[PDB]
Amino acid sequence: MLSFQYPDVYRDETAIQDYHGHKVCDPYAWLEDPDSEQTKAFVEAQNKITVPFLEQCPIRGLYKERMTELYDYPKYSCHFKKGKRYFYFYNTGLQNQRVLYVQDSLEGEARVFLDPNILSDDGTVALRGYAFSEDGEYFAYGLSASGSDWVTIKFMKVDGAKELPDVLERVKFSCMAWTHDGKGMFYNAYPQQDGKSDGTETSTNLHQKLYYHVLGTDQSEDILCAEFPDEPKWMGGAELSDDGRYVLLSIREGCDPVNRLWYCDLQQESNGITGILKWVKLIDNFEGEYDYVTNEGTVFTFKTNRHSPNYRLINIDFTDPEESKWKVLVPEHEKDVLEWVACVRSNFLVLCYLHDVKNTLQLHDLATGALLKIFPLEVGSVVGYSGQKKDTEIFYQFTSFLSPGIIYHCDLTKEELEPRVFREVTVKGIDASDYQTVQIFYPSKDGTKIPMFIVHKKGIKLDGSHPAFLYGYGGFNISITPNYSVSRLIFVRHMGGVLAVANIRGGGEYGETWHKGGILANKQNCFDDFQCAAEYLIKEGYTSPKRLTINGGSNGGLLVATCANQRPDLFGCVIAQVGVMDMLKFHKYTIGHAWTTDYGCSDSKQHFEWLIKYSPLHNVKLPEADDIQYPSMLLLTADHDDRVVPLHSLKFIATLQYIVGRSRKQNNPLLIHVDTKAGHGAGKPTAKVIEEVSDMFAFIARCLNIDWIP
């Protein structure tokens, strides 16, 4: 089936580096330069063979057509009130970017407030963050181009949707918080750097600072309120307390769910915001997370994991700050993870828990923490919510594997809290009643029971004849919960596939202990967990190795790439999206330095020892047995992915093609596709999203020779 020839890629055999005595050769190190003629030519040549391969079979067009049809359904976000107006995001169905609407009343005629679609013909300019002034009369929003993390902040006057001249540059991984006096807004920015800052560069991001922009002035006039010159990796985000009296600074270093918490009583500033604020270092260490919920005078309510892996709610009185004096408002649950908390209607708290990877939502009393109301939900996830302290109602969105979702509304001024369906959309074409979702718990190598959701058509015989799509992430305390995916459902309905999502360690499904079980020295647990998920699907008869496809993105790209090297015999197809492949050099580029809390850093001998054992780029090896070859592999990345620089995938594919691709027994393709005007994934336009899934499933279909089921 291989009618193409892999591109010629020069090997710099002199590129050898010493890692604590261990000599490591990196022949494709030159691919780290995205601007060179050599790297450009490499990308061109790779795409030259990948595209014709993906498009040869008529099934890509069949899939694309069905995806365009089924994905064409109205998509709404929860309504949210700002000042005297309501706002909500809405996509009629196939618009590249969702549009922000405004209405003066819940029953009023809605009108377009912000339409990103008119900013670019291909929809590559997207909204990335926003913040309304306390009175809801002014609006700040970030814009990112071509999928880059870089943001340009612009402003508008809400009444009449008037464009203002204020523009803030060099913004990245930024907060956006208006002071309640309506004078200005806090945000983060990086210092000027040589070269480009458009998402194609690989430059490390350090020395992020906290600034204050006074509306109606030039950015050059902005006030520097916080900086950490001696700690280049610290990032401090600001937020105003609900009463607007305190600026809360959450300082992070790395990706662990921990942060320092400093505060500033604005009343105590000698003469407003004129420089470095009089920060009071309440929590001055990275031992725990302190997520502000609300405050009543000096009593501040925080969601924390301090001495509580599953999270809980505590009250810290600024006037009696010692830890021994803190009050536990809502104790840690023995097993359920408290995902997030919101304060609404002055004294109500909305708590969202994760119970065996399914969300629950309930209302509690602020004063005592007592449970007041349970909002009933089917098995799924809460993916949207609205209701701030001054609001007297909440909106929340629920989604699941088989249904787009429902937005519920609950007027909290009523004695009887009666939540009601506010918006409910159904996709004509897919009958949810024909499929079923089951949750099982399989033992990993070490005996640990791992949860896994499996979605499939009702009544299938478990004879191992079905193609399967196994997804995983496993890291950064991220919980992989049920979500509605039209693309995955087409795989089930039109390709006769079985979907599976494994909640491997490293994630946050079972709190910080689950997270720690898949990081640093224990990172291998993630891989073992995932390989065991595949083994379960095979043993139980859901699929067979040759019909199994694994997929993951970013840290999940690392997941599937490592699994390909470790157990090539267990998979038929592997699709790794924007994955971290060079585990020895990831920390050198853009924001990669932040991931060391999950992976460790090669600069450390101990860490290098863990890393070198699983780093995808450094573990490509021909299977010893003549009857085993590498599975078909497709790496997807884009030229503006400044989160996980493209060099990771470029070097990995060059290695795969050389070491494995050259072997006579290797008949399965090893390809890469580098998209243009796209990045890590956030803000990607609908047009590109459709092209991407069509590529993915067309790849699976051709490699496994799967017939389309109309």
XYZ file of C-alpha atoms in Angstrom:
710
model
C 0.000 0.000 0.000
C 3.076 2.431 0.081
C 3.192 4.256 -3.196
C 5.451 7.040 -1.944
C 9.038 7.550 -0.868
C 10.087 9.304 2.358
C 11.877 12.674 1.961
C 15.654 12.876 2.147
C 16.589 14.367 5.525
C 20.170 15.252 6.393
C 21.617 13.684 9.540
C 24.041 15.837 11.511
C 26.072 12.990 13.014
C 28.315 15.501 14.818
C 25.411 16.726 16.950
C 26.309 14.881 20.152
C 25.654 16.186 23.664
C 26.710 14.882 27.051
C 23.951 14.404 29.609
C 25.567 13.514 32.940
C 27.940 11.120 31.184
C 25.332 9.778 28.755
C 26.193 10.807 25.185
C 23.058 11.680 23.204
C 23.126 12.150 19.424
C 20.585 14.558 17.979
C 21.091 14.360 14.162
C 17.954 16.394 13.410
C 18.739 19.241 15.853
C 18.736 21.631 12.886
C 14.972 21.167 12.635
C 14.769 23.295 15.784
C 15.162 26.359 13.551
C 11.750 27.010 11.990
C 13.076 29.792 9.737
C 15.851 27.980 7.889
C 15.507 26.979 4.218
C 16.340 23.438 5.326
C 13.458 23.213 7.803
C 11.057 24.882 5.356
C 12.019 22.346 2.680
C 11.575 19.508 5.155
C 8.037 20.633 5.997
C 7.170 21.079 2.328
C 8.435 17.610 1.432
C 6.597 15.903 4.277
C 3.272 17.560 3.478
C 3.901 16.630 -0.167
C 3.480 12.925 0.630
C 0.972 13.124 3.478
C -1.806 15.025 1.704
C -2.135 12.738 -1.354
C -2.157 9.771 1.013
C -4.975 11.192 3.130
C -7.012 12.259 0.106
C -6.594 9.223 -2.161
C -9.535 7.282 -0.744
C -13.109 8.579 -1.397
C -13.858 7.991 2.303
C -12.218 11.296 3.371
C -14.848 13.131 1.322
C -17.637 10.950 2.705
C -16.481 11.678 6.244
C -16.034 15.402 5.602
C -19.506 15.646 4.090
C -21.115 13.813 6.996
C -19.118 15.877 9.507
C -20.166 19.134 7.821
C -23.783 17.957 7.985
C -23.861 16.650 11.560
C -21.666 19.400 13.057
C -24.076 21.947 11.603
C -26.207 22.556 14.702
C -26.758 25.668 16.872
C -24.181 25.955 19.648
C -24.841 28.272 22.591
C -22.941 29.199 25.737
C -24.712 30.031 29.005
C -26.231 33.485 29.273
C -24.332 35.712 31.714
C -25.258 39.142 33.025
C -22.893 42.095 33.143
C -24.388 45.295 34.482
C -27.890 45.682 33.040
C -27.321 43.469 29.997
C -27.144 39.765 29.153
C -24.464 38.236 26.944
C -23.993 34.804 25.391
C -21.874 33.158 22.715
C -23.609 31.528 19.769
C -22.598 29.792 16.549
C -25.407 29.263 14.035
C -23.683 26.002 13.143
C -20.760 26.301 10.757
C -19.382 29.774 11.456
C -15.605 29.681 11.870
C -15.826 31.476 15.213
C -18.642 31.760 17.715
C -20.190 35.229 18.009
C -20.801 37.222 21.222
C -24.360 38.565 21.478
C -25.962 41.092 23.816
C -29.569 41.716 24.850
C -31.007 44.256 27.279
C -33.352 41.681 28.823
C -33.758 37.881 28.806
C -36.847 38.317 26.593
C -35.280 41.089 24.516
C -34.067 41.006 20.928
C -30.430 39.962 20.876
C -27.875 41.735 18.714
C -24.299 41.087 17.611
C -21.811 42.521 20.097
C -18.538 40.967 18.897
C -18.199 38.954 15.672
C -14.662 37.562 15.237
C -15.570 36.138 11.819
C -15.221 39.522 10.113
C -11.648 39.841 11.398
C -10.288 37.241 8.947
C -11.545 35.341 5.896
C -10.346 31.995 7.191
C -11.414 32.568 10.782
C -7.854 32.439 12.119
C -8.292 35.486 14.365
C -9.951 34.339 17.580
C -11.010 35.711 20.929
C -8.670 34.641 23.731
C -9.844 35.924 27.088
C -12.020 38.896 28.004
C -13.139 40.926 30.984
C -16.055 43.273 31.548
C -15.742 46.226 33.892
C -17.521 45.827 37.237
C -20.453 47.981 36.058
C -20.600 46.084 32.767
C -20.219 49.281 30.713
C -16.713 48.601 29.380
C -15.223 45.526 27.751
C -11.676 44.244 27.237
C -10.960 41.283 24.966
C -7.900 39.469 23.726
C -7.309 38.502 20.100
C -4.925 35.795 18.944
C -3.866 35.305 15.330
C -3.169 31.986 13.605
C -3.597 30.018 16.842
C -0.692 31.624 18.701
C -0.784 32.073 22.506
C 0.204 35.718 21.863
C -2.613 38.130 22.559
C -3.411 41.738 21.679
C -5.943 43.276 24.110
C -8.499 45.703 22.690
C -11.370 47.621 24.282
C -14.968 48.599 23.642
C -17.658 50.678 25.316
C -20.622 48.321 25.724
C -23.387 50.859 25.073
C -23.439 51.020 21.286
C -20.541 48.548 20.944
C -18.074 51.398 20.459
C -14.492 50.580 19.546
C -11.944 52.355 21.750
C -8.319 53.221 20.842
C -6.666 51.280 23.695
C -4.458 48.404 22.514
C -2.101 46.311 24.660
C 0.699 44.226 23.110
C 3.180 41.586 24.374
C 0.325 39.933 26.312
C 0.522 36.190 26.980
C -0.832 33.802 29.667
C -2.525 36.877 31.054
C -5.069 37.886 33.660
C -7.631 40.606 32.922
C -9.122 42.296 35.978
C -10.768 45.731 36.146
C -10.582 47.776 39.329
C -14.111 48.561 40.562
C -13.564 52.291 40.187
C -13.617 51.648 36.424
C -10.323 53.492 35.925
C -8.274 50.671 34.481
C -7.455 47.002 34.246
C -4.697 44.655 35.392
C -3.044 42.369 32.829
C 0.261 40.526 32.211
C 2.938 41.230 29.619
C 6.409 39.983 28.670
C 9.397 42.258 28.028
C 10.505 43.043 24.467
C 12.574 40.330 22.785
C 14.619 40.061 19.585
C 13.184 38.148 16.660
C 9.521 37.352 16.083
C 6.674 37.162 18.575
C 3.955 35.799 16.281
C 3.855 32.163 17.327
C 6.522 30.850 14.898
C 9.443 31.600 17.206
C 10.713 29.182 19.865
C 12.058 31.776 22.325
C 11.589 30.963 26.019
C 9.102 33.194 27.873
C 10.486 34.585 31.127
C 10.037 37.605 33.390
C 6.290 38.001 32.989
C 5.110 41.120 34.816
C 1.861 42.525 36.176
C 0.776 45.881 34.784
C -2.155 48.239 35.239
C -3.605 50.002 32.202
C -5.573 53.213 32.728
C -8.337 53.382 30.104
C -7.753 56.268 27.700
C -3.949 56.227 27.866
C -1.134 54.687 25.837
C 0.314 51.342 26.954
C 3.673 53.082 27.468
C 2.069 54.811 30.481
C 1.020 51.562 32.187
C 1.944 51.034 35.821
C 4.215 48.159 36.839
C 2.542 46.662 39.895
C 4.462 43.431 40.364
C 7.597 41.755 39.023
C 9.909 38.941 40.123
C 13.381 39.708 38.633
C 15.067 37.074 40.810
C 12.525 34.411 39.813
C 12.177 34.516 35.990
C 9.582 31.706 35.863
C 7.116 33.170 38.354
C 3.822 34.344 36.843
C 1.482 36.465 38.934
C -2.171 36.900 37.996
C -4.440 39.485 39.566
C -8.133 39.482 40.402
C -10.289 41.893 42.424
C -12.239 40.650 45.433
C -16.048 40.735 45.006
C -16.306 43.977 46.986
C -13.518 45.552 44.945
C -11.394 46.327 47.994
C -8.527 43.888 47.508
C -6.314 42.940 44.592
C -5.444 39.242 44.979
C -2.207 38.083 43.396
C -1.864 34.374 42.663
C 1.757 33.550 41.863
C 2.515 30.335 40.024
C 5.749 28.630 38.991
C 5.177 25.530 36.916
C 1.934 23.610 36.387
C 1.191 22.096 39.796
C -2.096 23.190 41.390
C -0.340 25.404 43.954
C 0.194 29.146 44.205
C 1.448 31.919 46.453
C -1.322 34.325 47.498
C -0.523 37.971 48.140
C -3.073 40.716 48.658
C -3.305 44.472 48.455
C -5.910 46.566 50.268
C -6.431 49.299 47.676
C -7.652 51.585 50.477
C -4.125 51.443 51.886
C -2.370 52.647 48.741
C -0.745 56.016 49.467
C -2.178 57.599 46.316
C -3.926 55.052 44.107
C -2.084 52.658 41.776
C 1.193 54.432 40.985
C 3.758 51.631 41.208
C 4.601 48.399 43.029
C 1.621 47.835 45.349
C 1.940 47.318 49.132
C 1.652 43.552 48.819
C 0.929 41.598 52.011
C 2.311 38.092 51.548
C -0.473 36.024 53.141
C 0.690 32.732 51.621
C 4.326 33.009 50.604
C 5.192 29.505 49.402
C 4.077 27.019 46.713
C 2.795 24.360 49.141
C -0.889 24.581 48.234
C -3.577 26.011 45.979
C -5.618 28.969 47.170
C -8.441 29.736 44.760
C -10.519 32.758 45.817
C -14.255 32.122 46.055
C -15.566 35.178 47.899
C -15.072 37.308 51.013
C -17.149 38.999 53.694
C -15.069 41.799 55.119
C -11.722 40.272 56.028
C -12.952 36.668 55.986
C -11.863 35.128 52.688
C -13.195 31.815 51.391
C -10.734 29.765 49.314
C -10.935 26.401 47.561
C -7.707 24.614 48.522
C -5.840 21.324 48.352
C -3.688 22.173 51.400
C -3.779 18.943 53.448
C -6.654 17.890 51.180
C -5.859 16.054 47.911
C -9.566 16.002 46.913
C -9.955 19.709 47.694
C -12.064 21.570 50.259
C -13.220 25.052 51.264
C -11.495 27.078 53.976
C -11.947 30.555 55.446
C -8.864 32.664 56.152
C -9.368 35.877 58.120
C -6.765 38.442 57.062
C -6.804 39.791 60.658
C -5.900 36.378 62.121
C -3.889 34.805 59.216
C -2.057 31.904 60.965
C -2.898 28.477 59.493
C -3.886 27.139 62.924
C -6.705 29.706 62.906
C -8.191 28.818 59.506
C -11.740 27.452 59.526
C -12.778 24.497 57.344
C -16.090 25.561 55.799
C -16.711 22.523 53.577
C -14.523 19.521 54.501
C -12.738 17.370 51.956
C -14.790 14.483 50.607
C -13.288 11.033 51.132
C -13.251 10.378 47.394
C -15.030 13.002 45.278
C -12.960 15.845 43.874
C -14.307 19.356 44.426
C -13.613 20.727 40.928
C -14.766 24.317 41.285
C -16.841 26.634 43.467
C -18.719 29.851 42.672
C -20.445 32.359 44.977
C -23.814 33.648 43.851
C -26.721 35.619 45.319
C -24.555 36.946 48.153
C -24.626 33.906 50.415
C -24.953 30.854 48.161
C -22.064 28.647 46.995
C -22.298 26.464 43.894
C -20.078 23.408 44.321
C -19.243 21.131 41.400
C -17.844 17.692 42.281
C -16.420 14.904 40.172
C -17.816 11.525 41.279
C -16.163 8.656 39.400
C -15.457 10.957 36.446
C -19.040 12.329 36.284
C -20.086 15.785 37.499
C -22.517 16.665 40.265
C -23.742 20.196 41.057
C -25.135 21.464 44.335
C -25.908 24.611 46.328
C -24.486 25.289 49.794
C -24.892 27.990 52.449
C -21.933 30.391 52.601
C -22.115 30.933 56.370
C -22.123 27.274 57.394
C -21.154 25.327 54.291
C -24.267 23.182 54.713
C -25.797 21.499 51.666
C -29.036 23.198 50.583
C -29.928 21.821 47.163
C -28.811 19.114 44.740
C -29.255 19.959 41.056
C -30.050 16.673 39.239
C -27.892 15.777 36.256
C -27.598 12.720 34.003
C -24.180 11.102 33.552
C -21.925 13.690 31.989
C -20.050 16.939 32.536
C -20.822 20.519 33.505
C -18.916 22.584 30.937
C -20.458 26.002 31.470
C -21.678 28.166 34.334
C -22.731 31.739 35.098
C -23.622 33.495 38.353
C -21.430 35.992 40.247
C -21.906 37.260 43.813
C -24.373 40.012 42.898
C -26.396 37.823 40.508
C -29.626 36.227 41.717
C -29.768 33.355 39.209
C -27.487 30.732 37.694
C -27.137 29.161 34.277
C -25.188 25.946 33.742
C -24.431 23.736 30.764
C -24.393 19.963 30.783
C -22.967 17.738 28.042
C -22.370 14.017 27.566
C -20.983 11.517 25.065
C -24.335 11.067 23.293
C -26.101 14.443 23.522
C -24.988 18.005 22.593
C -26.196 19.212 25.944
C -28.681 21.332 27.827
C -28.341 24.759 29.388
C -30.323 24.956 32.627
C -31.461 28.095 34.433
C -32.376 28.579 38.085
C -33.841 31.723 39.615
C -32.296 31.796 43.106
C -34.763 34.345 44.502
C -37.472 31.672 44.654
C -38.128 29.660 47.816
C -38.368 26.564 45.641
C -35.185 26.338 43.620
C -36.674 24.900 40.461
C -33.978 24.471 37.798
C -35.454 24.497 34.304
C -34.263 23.701 30.782
C -33.293 26.982 29.140
C -31.848 25.708 25.869
C -31.719 22.176 24.471
C -30.426 21.283 21.018
C -30.586 17.867 19.340
C -28.598 16.677 16.328
C -30.943 15.145 13.760
C -28.994 12.313 12.183
C -27.661 10.596 15.303
C -30.098 8.673 17.481
C -28.539 8.647 20.966
C -30.920 5.805 21.831
C -28.957 3.487 19.526
C -25.722 3.788 21.507
C -24.665 3.208 25.095
C -21.907 4.343 27.422
C -20.475 2.025 30.038
C -17.885 2.708 32.712
C -15.548 -0.060 33.821
C -12.494 -0.141 36.082
C -9.546 -2.238 34.906
C -6.427 -3.114 36.924
C -3.149 -1.622 35.756
C 0.235 -3.351 35.911
C 0.617 -2.503 39.619
C -2.972 -3.429 40.415
C -4.372 0.091 40.523
C -7.952 0.203 39.230
C -8.302 2.706 36.363
C -11.665 4.046 35.096
C -12.540 3.827 31.410
C -15.636 4.924 29.510
C -16.597 2.864 26.447
C -19.199 4.122 23.952
C -20.648 1.774 21.334
C -23.787 0.715 19.457
C -26.207 -1.367 21.520
C -26.057 -5.125 21.065
C -22.639 -5.480 19.438
C -21.080 -8.934 19.833
C -17.799 -8.776 21.723
C -15.873 -10.852 19.186
C -12.927 -8.485 18.715
C -13.967 -7.546 15.181
C -14.686 -3.853 15.738
C -12.316 -0.975 15.029
C -11.681 1.024 18.218
C -10.538 4.548 19.045
C -8.843 4.802 22.458
C -8.148 8.272 23.828
C -6.039 9.427 26.764
C -4.090 12.359 28.230
C -2.793 11.552 31.710
C -1.173 14.582 33.262
C -1.268 18.082 34.695
C -4.165 17.275 37.063
C -6.545 17.358 34.069
C -9.679 15.200 34.302
C -10.955 13.734 31.024
C -14.738 13.893 31.454
C -17.651 13.038 29.101
C -17.989 15.479 26.228
C -20.081 15.536 23.059
C -18.075 14.773 19.933
C -19.803 14.574 16.554
C -16.521 13.453 14.983
C -16.205 10.459 17.313
C -19.861 9.530 16.822
C -19.354 9.414 13.054
C -16.563 6.907 13.711
C -19.056 4.793 15.667
C -22.030 5.116 13.302
C -20.380 5.326 9.892
C -17.203 3.322 10.545
C -18.675 0.778 12.987
C -16.222 1.803 15.670
C -16.042 1.590 19.442
C -14.953 4.663 21.423
C -12.962 4.441 24.642
C -11.500 7.035 27.010
C -9.091 5.845 29.732
C -8.751 7.995 32.891
C -5.120 7.146 33.478
C -2.964 8.465 36.321
C -1.428 11.916 35.997
C -4.906 13.371 35.566
C -7.038 14.864 38.299
C -9.884 12.341 38.362
C -9.034 11.221 41.899
C -7.383 14.342 43.218
C -3.752 15.192 43.740
C -2.848 11.578 44.575
C -4.055 10.610 41.080
C -1.991 13.436 39.633
C 1.161 12.495 41.563
C 0.703 8.870 40.497
C 1.542 9.885 36.945
C 4.347 12.436 37.184
C 8.117 12.699 37.632
C 9.545 9.292 38.644
C 6.095 7.750 38.172
C 5.431 9.042 34.665
C 5.771 5.457 33.387
C 2.538 4.699 35.264
C 0.662 6.737 32.634
C 2.031 4.603 29.849
C 1.400 1.364 31.722
C -2.161 2.446 32.536
C -2.863 3.274 28.886
C -1.314 0.085 27.532
C -3.441 -1.854 30.025
C -6.562 -0.048 28.723
C -5.754 -1.290 25.223
C -5.158 -4.792 26.600
C -8.546 -4.685 28.314
C -10.382 -3.669 25.133
C -8.673 -6.536 23.314
C -9.128 -9.203 25.997
C -12.801 -8.351 26.505
C -13.466 -8.556 22.770
C -14.178 -4.925 21.933
C -11.388 -4.808 19.370
C -8.145 -6.400 18.201
C -4.594 -4.949 17.968
C -4.785 -4.510 14.221
C -8.092 -2.633 14.489
C -7.028 -0.427 17.427
C -6.216 3.246 17.021
C -4.890 5.370 19.907
C -5.079 9.160 19.974
C -3.950 11.937 22.294
C -2.897 15.593 22.065
C -0.076 17.592 23.664
C 0.836 15.641 26.838
C -1.501 13.093 25.226
C 0.587 13.199 22.075
C 3.533 12.204 24.248
C 1.322 9.443 25.622
C 0.534 7.736 22.343
C 4.004 8.273 20.890
C 5.577 6.556 23.874
C 3.051 3.734 23.655
C 3.957 3.225 20.001
C 7.634 2.755 20.967
C 6.908 0.587 24.004
C 4.216 -1.690 22.602
C 4.075 -1.350 18.795
C 2.433 -4.804 18.725
C -0.602 -3.521 20.597
C -1.812 -0.895 18.120
C -2.768 -0.692 14.477
C -2.863 3.081 14.182
C -1.526 6.020 16.208
C -2.524 9.670 15.801
C -0.380 12.002 17.921
C -1.477 15.631 17.926
C 0.835 18.531 18.883
C 2.845 16.201 21.112
C 5.887 16.832 23.296
C 8.418 14.409 21.772
C 11.847 15.704 22.826
C 11.762 15.161 26.573
C 15.357 16.301 26.960
C 14.852 19.729 25.407
C 11.196 20.633 25.988
C 12.047 23.126 28.749
C 14.168 25.272 26.397
C 11.312 26.603 24.291
C 8.500 29.125 24.854
C 6.476 28.064 27.917
C 8.007 24.572 28.156
C 9.830 25.491 31.342
C 6.473 25.309 33.125
C 6.024 21.568 32.445
C 8.968 20.507 34.598
C 6.626 20.089 37.556
C 5.045 17.132 35.734
C 8.046 15.751 33.833
C 11.154 16.918 35.615
C 14.124 18.519 33.812
C 17.076 16.895 32.009
C 19.468 19.326 33.714
C 19.017 17.118 36.775
C 20.791 13.746 36.719
C 17.942 12.032 38.593
C 15.346 13.460 36.236
C 17.357 12.690 33.112
C 17.352 9.057 34.231
C 13.528 8.948 34.193
C 13.189 10.983 31.015
C 15.650 9.129 28.811
C 13.691 5.909 29.366
C 10.484 7.145 27.747
C 11.317 10.240 25.650
C 9.678 9.428 22.278
C 12.501 10.991 20.262
C 15.066 8.859 22.074
C 13.299 5.518 22.065
C 12.552 4.808 18.422
C 13.747 1.253 17.878
C 13.017 -1.480 15.352
C 10.948 -4.217 16.993
C 13.167 -7.281 17.508
C 10.644 -9.774 16.133
C 10.369 -10.043 12.341
C 6.581 -10.381 12.653
C 6.212 -7.020 14.431
C 6.476 -3.602 12.804
C 5.489 -0.141 14.026
C 1.804 0.760 13.771
C 0.708 3.300 11.168
C 1.455 6.743 12.605
C 0.203 10.246 11.875
C 1.619 13.268 13.684
C -0.383 16.487 13.439
C 1.099 19.882 14.221
C 1.005 23.443 12.914
C 3.516 26.199 12.231
C 2.136 28.609 14.839
C 1.985 26.114 17.715
C 3.977 28.120 20.222
C 2.675 26.044 23.139
C 4.430 22.852 21.993
C 6.880 24.031 19.326
C 6.581 22.044 16.025
C 10.240 20.957 16.224
C 9.065 18.181 18.560
C 7.052 16.492 15.818
C 9.522 17.370 13.030
C 12.427 15.666 14.802
C 10.284 12.710 15.825
C 8.999 12.018 12.301
C 12.493 12.310 10.802
C 13.663 9.723 13.351
C 10.727 7.397 12.751
C 11.177 7.465 8.979
C 14.906 6.832 9.185
C 15.101 4.171 11.898
C 11.811 2.393 11.257
C 10.641 3.615 7.849
C 13.736 2.217 6.103
C 13.170 -1.356 7.300
C 11.790 -3.811 4.746
C 9.163 -5.179 7.163
C 7.726 -1.681 7.685
C 4.689 -1.354 5.411
C 2.629 0.881 7.706
C 3.036 4.616 6.909
C 4.731 7.082 9.256
C 3.531 10.569 8.319
C 3.306 14.140 9.574
C 1.099 17.016 8.548
C 2.087 20.576 9.405
C -0.837 22.965 9.048
C -0.506 26.695 8.361
C -2.066 29.623 10.260
C -2.876 27.271 13.156
C -1.412 26.579 16.579
C -1.905 24.269 19.538
C -5.660 24.093 19.043
C -7.445 26.841 20.995
C -9.396 29.180 18.760
C -8.986 26.959 15.697
C -11.735 27.834 13.162
C -14.538 25.388 12.360
C -13.259 24.966 8.796
C -9.913 23.717 10.084
C -11.506 21.560 12.794
C -13.519 19.751 10.095
C -10.473 19.263 7.865
C -8.505 17.881 10.804
C -11.011 15.223 11.861
C -11.495 14.258 8.204
C -7.726 13.716 7.919
C -7.631 11.699 11.141
C -10.442 9.320 10.306
C -9.474 9.014 6.640
C -6.026 7.961 7.865
C -7.558 5.318 10.133
C -9.858 4.079 7.360
C -7.091 3.656 4.806
C -4.550 2.111 7.164
C -7.037 -0.400 8.576
C -9.012 -0.713 5.301
C -12.350 0.150 6.927
C -15.448 0.409 4.708
C -17.755 3.403 5.096
C -21.169 2.458 6.473
C -23.700 4.960 5.006
